Design a protein around this ligand. Structure first.
Ligand SMILES: Nc1ncnc2c1ncn2[C@@H]1O[C@H](COP(=O)(O)OP(=O)(O)OP(=O)(O)O)[C@@H](O)[C@H]1O
Ligand SMILES: Nc1ncnc2c1ncn2[C@@H]1O[C@H](COP(=O)(O)OP(=O)(O)OP(=O)(O)O)[C@@H](O)[C@H]1O
Ligand SMILES: Nc1ncnc2c1ncn2[C@@H]1O[C@H](COP(=O)(O)OP(=O)(O)OP(=O)(O)O)[C@@H](O)[C@H]1O
Ligand SMILES: Nc1ncnc2c1ncn2[C@@H]1O[C@H](COP(=O)(O)OP(=O)(O)OP(=O)(O)O)[C@@H](O)[C@H]1O
Ligand SMILES: [Mg+2]
Ligand SMILES: [Mg+2]
Ligand SMILES: [Mg+2]
Ligand SMILES: [Mg+2]
Lengths: 262, 348, 328, 361, 76, 372, 50
């Protein structure tokens, strides 16, 4: 430790001057734009692993001539706070007890493949993908999802259906696009979209909510969920009870496999 | 010596402009620099205290920050393009048929301009403010170039959207500083030209752009009416539809007379036909009257496209004259291409 | 470029006179080219590629998946037409010069949702060994308009810098559908990026080795200014699988499935009507769930019967069973 | 020599020539006889891109006639002195307007729609060359030419072809480019498109598409289309005389003419209105042959047979029939492009696959 | 004997040099017009480098030939 | 897949030799000829007594290669070859003035001089392997009033002339075999400008392409290096720089070879989820090779990229040569030779060696006929 | 001025988010402290999903 840090601090500050990684160049350089507004065509010291850093990373630049001293993994935005949990859903299995025939279509295709890939190596083919929950209000639909994600301890994102709709346009689909990038970044992933009947009954103004917004968000979500992306295994859990606010490219199966009636 | 002069300027240094914001004591002044932030500064003895008033431009030093001298008023780079607009000038009667509107314009503008004193007897608020509105192509602006030339008073003029910046309230400061310049100037005519997006209403379910509209609009209201009331500087406002405008820009007592300049009449087209045929060569053409009346649809700009199109039928025949054989195929053709879309407007 | 110094705008906003330093030709320096200049006194050190405005187009360049050509969204000549329009003139321009034709660059991929229209293009993406840049049509919309005009434009010219690349315009059913004026709506601000997508395809210079794919769920509403046959040229409909085409897909799906012999894939096609090959992709997984309740390492014929029955009932329960989303 | 800041000139204001006993200054100072007290000579205030202004006694090598009150000058960045004068700067986007050595296609690689080629040459090209015959006759030259009609009629092609042929400067502009999220910076693309244009006159300002600025609306209630139209209102300001619209022209192509503002209907803006028709029987035959010029074909085909079997086609579709012939040709395995393959590219690709549903017709 | 020399930028210039002249003479005549010293110059013909102590006709180079100029580099 | 290859360590100031060697032994016939040297190998006389120093270079490569194949080793010594190079060409024994030792220079030159030695010893049958023959037509602009055809123009490696029109190697090669040769002697007048086109009439079996990467600034009167992204593809097709005659035959054979290549590209991936498989594909390919095969002939006009010498840092007079070579059994698995520091690298690392910036970029690119 | 023909209050849209969190707030760290005291002019001008 002692002799390694001597030469660690040689090329480190005093100020460590956060940058934003615009693009890499492959010669051990990158073009950063700083929050303080001057660009730098930075080097890269080459102990932080040259290509382990990608656009959107936050970079530590040296107090003198800028080299990428190092790279910060994680920079807490308040925008992934909304998705991420701050509380534990202490009611799990058998506090939503009953519907023990409609919990074998979410713990034989959502919880169980993640817990055991063993059973799904045996059949081969690709494991279950997605579910849609629907039925009459007060059948525990909202809590079921929170109760299987408590037990697996996979990365629980939860997003409300009424925050996808903003009174601002175009940044709605960017929010939805974020949610699945976090899911793909975190290998075991369960995304609860709570309420996606709240996309066809809810609108604000007519110039940034309205129909155009509703079409855009729906389409973004197809690319995210599977589309062309080929991203990490995301289980999707959708609460809805109005099942014609959803695309005819989403309520076909092979994205959402078995459908659950309550 | 031409290079010796270059050495004595090069060895001098610059100076930083401010204005006297506020007297603190008598040997210390608050200035607001043109770099921005206010400073507290001292003075050279060469400047006298009683020539230091507030709103007077001063030099400062750039290494001592001390007034050496009073400087003339600062003026916008933009408004020096605006006195370089008067081109496109024409005679007193340079829109034919809308001649009745020229007379109506000068009542408000030129009659109090020469003598404000004939209105003292009358006892009214000095006539200020004009709105022009019509279907485009009737020379609302062509008239402005005529009333700049004929009177010969200081003239400005504004680009449409090139006095819209990227800073909210910096696009207010500019238009503020052209009014000041225009009040220092004797009998100045101020044309706001094609204000339609720089006069919008409250919106703000739009983008952030509509708050630039709104900041900039408020500046006009204070200027027109506050402790500035204009009696020698005159406002002329040109718009293409007068319900694009917010109703404090449709408020008379800032806009006393709201003048409509219409589409040329049946025989207002004819009055342009007699002036634009002396702007061309001909073997002789005085047979306008029936044909133009009954190939109506035109606006004032389309009379000069009938002239140009008669010079295309000429080019086919190989002539350097306008023959009425050339023209009456022209008025038939210019009319037909203009059937493309209406110009339907409902005016107050 | 001032003919013999240059006027640069720093990223500090501050404008300066710079010249050529110690390793640059004048030939090197273009107009609109970025340059690195020395922080202390401004002089061109190193030329740099054009424009640091693209940084959110560096999230839409992605690396190709591994999907064998052999796996297809259905066995038809239909993927072979795609192989004449996109694939073959990239490997051998020898034949398209003898014909003397200029290869068709455009294609539409259209038909009912879920047939694997993108599946046959992911197969092609492993195959061509030409860079794929993929686009989202509802990621081209932002609060301030004219921001999205900029984004679209820079992506396309970056493909013009490249040679042998494919820009796959996905999900242009929102932005790329037919323009129409409202008169009160904010529909105009969206119609702006539609117009930018038209004027880049044709350019003022024709496409510099850009094969263009349009992924549309719908052929029904698309712009006649993007549907014109001069930039989408030959367009091959990949339609619903048949009684045989569904057996073919299901033979791949049950090949990848550890199964026991005695199965009929011809039967399964009988049982299903004209329906997606994503339906058939979920026969196997729901048959894998009936295998697991019983505790098997294999699937048989029987569990495919139940699986098929389940998917069919849900189709009635919803809409889109053979639907194009009506019309032609 | 470099480096040195580049600034704009606020004004020239000028303090009196130094021969006076009493300072040299317009704005007179206290104290009796001055010359170099705080009296300095000729004065220029320049405004920097370092966001300030400075009053200097400027260099006398460069005249107050070589100083405009909006001229782009060098200022020395070590200490602000007007160093020298520099060309006026336009945006890099506006510097992308001029040609790359733009290929010509003359009027002779555009077959069909003959009457349109003649109507464009008349509107734009000849008033530039024969401006002398315009002054002697006494007419004005038009202020632009509109092109309108269905997509696929060669509008975009013609403009490139005709601009290059007399080598009138083909300025390359996209309508959506003017629409930028930066306000009062999109408008400088409109302004410098004319600042450039008069230096590079005779010239053609080709805006491809007119619909991104050209809106029907200009009373827009509660939308952000009031920022968009500000590149449209600033456009009409420069199609009103300050002269320099008599050699500076405009071409415009658009696919739909019904979304344009009524201030683009009127003359003095777009004056000449050429409609580009969907080709007739003879016309279609020409267009097909202009593609077949490039490619190997069978000699047993007749361009009149081909003209029978197309009904209401335009040139983009006839691009889609000559190329489609060679798809069918390669698939057979034949070197040449069969005369049956020209007939079969019409039906294979129309612009649509069969004629739609029929269930009672 | 007339030969042609292809420069770094794909530009062919002429040179008149004898069949009894060393490569030091070739590089000398080229050093005048490019401002490039002999010790960086590399003259290639037939893929073989043309060393300074051997003459032009030791590589069997006679007229109507084109030599290819490239520049060296150092280090290690 | 591969063993764990060994490298050369430095003696200090030694990487300019080490890096380049790795690449030369990738070339199949090159490694064979030195391995199989006898004292029964001849020479080619036309005037040189440097033919016996040529022999000495060949033993040192044989044994340097011998260490490379052996694994009793972590260091290949370059040491006797270095003395032997300095003896053979004494411009490497010049002192560096206020620098380091006996002078260090240059991957380009290096290959030229080592290839000179090898073509004498191993005969002309080996000379032809890299030797490229053109058909050059020196022909007037306007009507020809004089013509000369030179097939005595030759190279042994192509020159990609970077004009700043290089965005791809193919472009500058294709308009670097087009040049305008100015005259000075009355043939139709003195300084009449001729359009000259070289088209290839004989491809080599091993293609070498050298980048011109240098500029002499006349605007400072000082040499520099320029770099810049010039993309080279993995699969280089050079069909368009041939004469029609040679092309039709190579392109017809290529299409059959593409079918076997396609079956390989599917099959290789399957069995994963090497030397023996390689030998079966070679046997299949040779049936489709034309029966006109000889030394120095490619039975395709398609090549794959098997080696890159890279150069880093600032302006010319500066270099730290590492080299990258592609495996002899694999085609996405490449070894990085950082003197005696050896590592596995991927296809992505190879692409970035097209330059831009102020570090590693291609100077020499080594191919071999068709793929593997 | 359109957000109460939009969804009956755009405030009621945000309120639904609040209240939906609230479905698990009696157990996370032991026992609500954050009471959401909602208020409105009449209880009938709330959607029946509240
Ligand atoms: N099987 C059950 N056992 C225990 N509690 C249940 C069960 N089903 C529902 N509840 C309770 O009913 C209430 C509402 O159900 P939940 O919020 O879980 O989803 P829902 O069906 O979408 O209904 P809503 O959103 O209208 O309240 C919760 O307090 C939940 O604990
Ligand atoms: N009334 C007219 N008589 C003669 N020429 C005219 C007339 N109106 C317009 N023109 C011609 O058209 C040019 C441009 O028209 P102008 O800008 O004057 O119209 P405007 O009515 O103010 O339109 P807008 O309301 O769109 O600004 C003139 O400079 C002139 O050449
Ligand atoms: N024929 C098929 N074979 C196997 N799987 C398929 C098939 N068709 C669809 N799928 C499954 O569906 C997934 C997503 O479908 P894809 O994105 O390919 O849709 P599409 O045909 O473009 O339709 P949409 O209009 O819904 O976008 C595929 O990744 C695959 O798992
Ligand atoms: N009359 C014609 N003669 C020759 N070829 C034609 C003709 N019209 C169109 N083409 C061919 O079709 C191509 C595409 O049409 P082009 O883009 O020129 O037309 P447009 O009417 O301006 O439509 P858009 O604005 O949608 O691009 C042309 O580049 C050309 O190859
Ligand atoms: Mg609930
Ligand atoms: Mg006007
Ligand atoms: Mg899709
Ligand atoms: Mg176009």
């Amino acid at each position: 430790q002692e002799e390694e840090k001597k030469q660690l601090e040689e090329i480190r500050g005093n100020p460590l001057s956060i940058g934003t990684l615009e693009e890499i160049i492959d010669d051990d350089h990158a073009i950063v734009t700083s929050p303080t507004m001057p660009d730098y065509y930075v080097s890269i010291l080459s102990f932080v692993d040259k290509e382990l850093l990608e656009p959107g990373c936050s970079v530590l630049l040296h107090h003198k001539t800028m080299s990428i001293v190092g790279v910060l993994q994680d920079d807490a935005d308040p925008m992934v706070s909304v998705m991420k949990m701050d509380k534990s859903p202490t009611e799990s299995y058998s506090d939503i007890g009953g519907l023990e025939s409609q919990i074998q279509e979410i713990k034989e295709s959502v919880e169980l493949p993640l817990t055991h890939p063993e059973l799904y190596e045996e059949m081969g083919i690709k494991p279950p993908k997605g579910v849609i929950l629907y039925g009459a209000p007060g059948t525990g639909k909202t809590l079921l999802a929170k109760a299987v994600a408590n037990q697996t301890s996979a990365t629980f994102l939860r997003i409300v259906g009424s925050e996808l709709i903003q009174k601002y346009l175009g940044d709605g689909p960017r929010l939805c696009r974020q949610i699945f990038k976090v899911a793909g970044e975190n290998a075991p992933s369960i995304v609860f979209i709570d309420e996606i009947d709240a996309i066809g009954t809810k609108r604000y103004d007519s110039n940034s909510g309205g129909e155009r917004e509703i079409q855009r968000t729906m389409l973004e979500l197809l690319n995210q969920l599977d589309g062309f992306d080929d991203r990490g295994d995301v289980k999707v859990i959708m609460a809805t009870n109005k099942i014609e606010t959803l695309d005819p490219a989403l309520i076909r199966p092979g994205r959402i496999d078995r459908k659950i009636l309550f | 010596d031409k290079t010796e002069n270059d050495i004595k300027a090069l060895q001098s240094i610059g100076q930083l402009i401010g204005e006297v914001m506020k007297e603190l004591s008598e040997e210390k002044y608050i200035v607001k620099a043109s770099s921005g932030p206010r400073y507290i500064v001292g003075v050279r003895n060469s400047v006298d205290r009683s020539k230091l008033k507030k709103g007077v431009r001063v030099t400062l030093d750039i290494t001592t920050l001390t007034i050496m001298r009073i400087l003339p008023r600062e003026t916008d780079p933009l408004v020096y393009n605006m006195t370089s607009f008067e081109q496109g000038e024409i005679t007193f009667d340079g829109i034919g048929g809308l001649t009745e509107q020229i007379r109506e314009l000068r009542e408000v503008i030129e009659l109090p301009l020469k003598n404000p004193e004939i209105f003292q007897r009358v006892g009214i608020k000095p006539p200020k403010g004009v709105l022009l509105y019509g279907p485009p192509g009737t020379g609302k602006t062509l008239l402005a170039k005529a009333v700049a030339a004929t009177i010969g008073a200081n003239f400005i003029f504004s680009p449409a959207s090139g006095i819209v910046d990227k800073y909210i309230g910096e696009s207010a400061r500019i238009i503020r500083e052209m009014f000041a310049y225009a009040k220092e100037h004797e009998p100045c005519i101020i044309f706001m030209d094609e204000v339609d997006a720089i006069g919008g209403r409250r919106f703000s379910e739009g983008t952030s752009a509509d708050r630039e509209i709104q900041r900039t609009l408020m500046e006009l209201l204070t200027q027109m009416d506050g402790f500035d009331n204009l009696g020698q500087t005159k406002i002329i406002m040109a718009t293409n539809r007068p319900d694009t405008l917010d109703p404090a820009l449709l408020r008379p007592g800032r806009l006393d007379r709201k003048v409509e300049i219409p589409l040329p009449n049946e025989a207002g087209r004819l009055e342009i036909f007699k002036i634009h045929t002396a702007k061309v060569k001909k073997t002789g053409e005085f047979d306008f009257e029936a044909a133009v009346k009954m190939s109506d649809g035109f606006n004032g700009a389309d009379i000069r496209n009938c002239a140009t199109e008669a010079g295309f039928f000429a080019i086919r025949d190989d002539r350097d004259h306008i023959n009425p054989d050339d023209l009456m195929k022209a008025v038939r053709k210019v009319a037909e291409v203009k059937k493309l879309e209406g110009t339907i407007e409902y005016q107050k | 470029i001032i003919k013999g110094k240059y006027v640069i705008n720093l990223k500090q906003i501050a404008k300066f006179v710079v010249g050529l330093g110690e390793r640059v030709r004048p030939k090197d320096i273009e107009e609109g080219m970025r340059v690195g200049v020395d922080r202390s006194k401004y002089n061109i050190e190193l030329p740099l590629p054009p424009r640091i405005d693209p940084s959110v187009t560096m999230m839409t360049v992605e690396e190709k998946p591994d999907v064998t050509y052999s796996d297809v969204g259905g066995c038809k000549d239909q993927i072979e037409k795609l192989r004449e329009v996109v694939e073959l003139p990239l490997l051998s321009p020898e034949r398209f010069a003898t014909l003397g034709i200029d290869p068709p660059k455009g294609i539409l991929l259209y038909g009912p949702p879920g047939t694997g229209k993108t599946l046959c293009a992911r197969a092609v993406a492993n195959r061509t060994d030409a860079t794929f840049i993929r686009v989202i049509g509802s990621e081209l919309v932002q609060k301030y308009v004219g921001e999205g005009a900029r984004m679209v434009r820079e992506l396309f010219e970056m493909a013009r810098t490249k040679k042998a690349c494919i820009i796959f315009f996905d999900e242009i059913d929102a932005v790329g559908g037919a323009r129409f004026d409202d008169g009160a709506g904010g529909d105009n601000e969206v119609q702006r990026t539609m117009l930018e997508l038209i004027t880049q395809l044709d350019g003022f210079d024709p496409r510099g080795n850009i094969k263009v794919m349009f992924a549309t769920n719908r052929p029904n509403t698309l712009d006649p200014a993007l549907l014109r046959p001069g930039r989408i040229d030959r367009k091959v409909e990949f339609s619903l699988p048949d009684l045989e085409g569904r057996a073919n897909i299901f033979r791949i799906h049950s090949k990848s499935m550890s199964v026991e012999r005695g199965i009929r894939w011809e039967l399964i096609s009988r049982l299903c009507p004209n329906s997606t090959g994503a339906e058939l992709r979920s026969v196997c997984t729901e048959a894998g769930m009936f295998a697991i309740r019983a505790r098997r390492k294999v699937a048989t014929e029987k569990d495919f019967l139940k699986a098929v029955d389940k998917v069919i009932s849900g189709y009635k329960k919803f809409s889109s069973t053979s639907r194009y989303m009506q019309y032609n | 020599q470099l480096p040195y800041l580049v600034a704009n000139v606020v004004e020239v204001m000028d303090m009196n020539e130094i021969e006076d006993k009493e300072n040299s200054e317009s704005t007179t100072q206290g104290g009796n006889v001055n010359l170099d007290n705080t009296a300095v000579g000729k004065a220029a205030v320049v405004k920097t891109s370092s966001r300030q202004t400075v009053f200097l006694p400027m260099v006398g090598l460069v005249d107050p006639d070589k100083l405009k009150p909006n001229d782009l000058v060098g200022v020395n960045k070590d200490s602000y002195l007007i160093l020298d004068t520099l060309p006026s700067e336009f945006d890099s986007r506006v510097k992308a307007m001029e040609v790359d050595e733009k290929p010509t296609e003359t009027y002779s690689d555009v077959g069909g729609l003959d009457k349109q080629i003649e109507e464009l040459v008349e509107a734009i090209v000849l008033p530039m060359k024969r401006a002398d015959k315009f002054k002697d006759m006494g007419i004005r030259a038009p202020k632009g030419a509109l092109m309108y009609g269905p997509p696929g009629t060669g509008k975009t092609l013609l403009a490139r072809a005709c601009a290059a042929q007399t080598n009138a400067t083909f300025l390359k502009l996209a309508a959506p480019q003017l629409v930028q999220m930066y306000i009062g910076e999109g408008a400088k693309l409109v302004r410098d498109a004319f600042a450039l244009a008069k230096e590079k006159a005779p010239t053609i300002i080709f805006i491809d598409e007119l619909d991104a600025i050209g809106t029907k609306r200009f009373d827009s209630e509660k939308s952000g289309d009031r920022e968009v139209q500000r590149t449209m209102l600033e456009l009409l300001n420069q199609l009103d005389g300050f002269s320099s619209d008599d050699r500076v022209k405009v071409l415009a192509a658009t696919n739909r003419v019904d979304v344009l503002d009524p201030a683009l209907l009127r003359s003095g803006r777009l004056d000449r209105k050429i409609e580009f028709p969907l080709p007739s029987e003879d016309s279609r035959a020409q267009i097909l042959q202009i593609h077949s010029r490039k490619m190997t074909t069978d000699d047993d085909i007749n361009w009149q047979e081909l003209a029978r079997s197309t009904d209401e086609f335009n040139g983009a579709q006839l691009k889609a029939v000559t190329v489609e012939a060679g798809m069918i040709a390669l698939r057979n395995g034949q070197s040449s492009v069969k005369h049956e393959d020209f007939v079969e590219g019409i039906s294979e690709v129309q612009a649509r696959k069969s004629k739609s549903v029929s269930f009672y017709a | 004997m007339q030969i042609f020399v292809k420069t770094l930028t794909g530009k062919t210039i002429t040179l008149e040099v004898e069949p009894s002249d060393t490569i030091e003479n070739v590089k000398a005549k080229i050093q005048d017009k490019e401002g490039i010293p002999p010790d960086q110059q590399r003259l290639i013909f037939a893929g073989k480098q043309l060393e300074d102590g051997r003459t032009l006709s030791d590589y069997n180079i006679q007229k109507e030939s084109t030599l290819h100029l490239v520049l060296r580099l150092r280090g290690g | 897949f591969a063993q764990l290859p060994v490298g050369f360590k430095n003696m200090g100031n030694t990487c300019y030799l080490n890096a380049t060697l790795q690449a030369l032994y990738r070339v199949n016939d090159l490694r064979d000829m030195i391995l199989n040297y006898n004292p029964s190998q001849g020479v080619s006389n036309s005037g040189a007594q440097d033919e016996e120093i040529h022999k000495q270079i060949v033993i040192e490569m044989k044994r340097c290669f011998e260490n490379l194949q052996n694994k009793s080793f972590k260091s290949v010594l370059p040491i006797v070859l270095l003395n032997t190079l300095r003896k053979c060409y004494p411009q490497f024994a010049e002192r560096d003035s206020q620098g380091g030792f006996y002078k260090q220079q240059d991957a380009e030159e290096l290959f030229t001089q080592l290839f000179h030695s090898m073509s004498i010893v191993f005969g002309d049958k080996f000379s032809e392997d890299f030797r490229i023959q053109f058909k050059t037509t020196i022909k007037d602009t306007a009507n020809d009033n004089d013509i000369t055809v030179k097939e005595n123009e030759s190279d042994s490696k192509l020159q990609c002339h970077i004009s700043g029109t290089t965005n791809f190697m193919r472009n500058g090669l294709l308009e670097g075999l087009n040049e305008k040769i100015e005259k000075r002697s009355d043939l139709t007048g003195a300084n009449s400008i001729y359009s000259v086109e070289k088209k290839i009439s004989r491809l080599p079996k091993f293609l070498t392409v050298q980048y011109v990467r240098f500029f002499w600034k006349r605007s400072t009167n000082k040499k520099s290096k320029i770099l810049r992204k010039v993309v080279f593809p993995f699969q280089l097709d050079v069909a368009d720089m041939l004469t029609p005659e040679y092309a039709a035959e190579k392109v017809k054979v290529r299409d059959e070879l593409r079918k076997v290549e396609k079956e390989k590209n599917e099959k290789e991936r399957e069995i994963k989820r090497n030397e023996s498989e390689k030998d079966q594909w070679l046997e299949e390919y040779k049936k489709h090779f034309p029966p006109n095969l000889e030394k120095g002939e490619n039975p395709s006009c398609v090549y794959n990229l098997i080696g890159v010498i890279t150069h880093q840092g600032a302006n010319s007079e500066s270099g730290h040569y590492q080299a990258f070579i592609r495996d002899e059994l694999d085609e996405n698995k490449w070894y990085k030779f950082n003197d005696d520091k050896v590592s596995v690298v991927e296809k992505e690392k190879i692409e970035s060696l097209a330059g831009g910036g102020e570090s590693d970029s291609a100077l020499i690119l080594m191919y071999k006929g068709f793929g593997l | 001025s359109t957000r109460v023909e939009g969804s009956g209050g755009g405030d009621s849209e945000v309120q639904r988010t609040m209240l939906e969190l609230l479905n698990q707030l009696d157990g996370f760290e032991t026992s609500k402290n954050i009471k959401i005291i909602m208020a409105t002019n009449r209880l009938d001008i709330l959607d029946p999903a509240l």
